[PDB]
Amino acid sequence: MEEEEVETFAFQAEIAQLMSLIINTFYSNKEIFLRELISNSSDALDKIRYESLTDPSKLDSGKELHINLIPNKQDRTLTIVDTGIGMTKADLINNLGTIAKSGTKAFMEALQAGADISMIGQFGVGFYSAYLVAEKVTVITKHNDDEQYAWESSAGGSFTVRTDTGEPMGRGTKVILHLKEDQTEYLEERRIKEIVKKHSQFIGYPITLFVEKE
Numbered sequence: 001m002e003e004e005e006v007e008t009f010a011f012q013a014e015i016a017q018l019m020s021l022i023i024n025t026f027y028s029n030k031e032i033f034l035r036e037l038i039s040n041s042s043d044a045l046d047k048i049r050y051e052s053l054t055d056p057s058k059l060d061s062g063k064e065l066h067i068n069l070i071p072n073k074q075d076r077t078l079t080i081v082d083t084g085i086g087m088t089k090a091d092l093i094n095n096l097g098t099i100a101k102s103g104t105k106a107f108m109e110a111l112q113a114g115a116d117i118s119m120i121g122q123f124g125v126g127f128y129s130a131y132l133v134a135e136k137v138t139v140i141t142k143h144n145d146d147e148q149y150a151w152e153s154s155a156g157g158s159f160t161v162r163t164d165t166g167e168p169m170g171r172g173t174k175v176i177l178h179l180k181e182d183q184t185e186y187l188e189e190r191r192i193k194e195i196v197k198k199h200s201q202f203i204g205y206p207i208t209l210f211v212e213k214e
């Protein structure tokens with residue numbers, strides 16, 4: 001029998017409030033969740049690109065800087081993979097839920113008052129837009145300085161972090177959105193292409209959509 005250690009963390013209170021607001025309120029324009037993922041991937045890819053200019057060995061773990069979109073209609077997941085700089089364990093714990101974000105309160109107030117959900121990116125809390133469409137999010141990540149880790153949450157106020165025993169990634173971050181049953185349009189090729197074209201046209205890294213043959 002294998003033994004695996006898990007650590008469970010509480011979300012910072014306002015982040016938990018925001019997650020409940022995002023999950024339990026209807027919003028139109030939920031398609032912007034993908035813009036937010038691609039934008040975060042692009043930022044991570046920038047980080048490794050710049051780091052590699054001085055230290056080409058930081059690319060030992062993979063030279064290609066790109067984003068892959070992987071819809072899976074069998075398990076109702078949409079996976080966004082990038083070969084950006086990746087996150088350490090401490091980064092996941094800190095950056096994905098335990099540390100307050102200065103934009104969370106302002107954003108909840110904006111939203112309450114009728115701001116379009118598209119505004120979320122501006123408030124620095126765009127990652128949480130995943131919960132517009134997903135009931136559960138898993139973030140698997142590998143930084144050159146750390147082992148591969150998995151973060152996961154179904155909201156409800158906690159997340160977990162564990163060493164990832166799944167398929168090794170060279171470097172980068174994979175976000176797996178377990179979509180809500182009414183949000184399966186985001187597994188369709190045409191819809192994904194539509195929303196990438198509408199919202200993610202100036203990503204300066206290649207993006208490839210992988211479509212399972214029907």
Ligand SMILES: CN1CCC(NC(=O)c2cc(-c3c(O)cc(O)cc3Oc3ccc([N+](=O)[O-])cc3)on2)CC1
Nearest residue numbers: 037040041044082084085086087091095124127173175
């Ligand atoms: C010290 N650490 C600091 C963090 C550095 N890594 C990254 O920035 C990073 C981000 C991602 C990264 C990613 O490649 C895709 C994503 O969809 C989300 C990511 O991380 C984020 C986590 C939180 C937030 N947020 O809430 O604002 C935004 C992005 O992968 N690597 C690595 C060095």
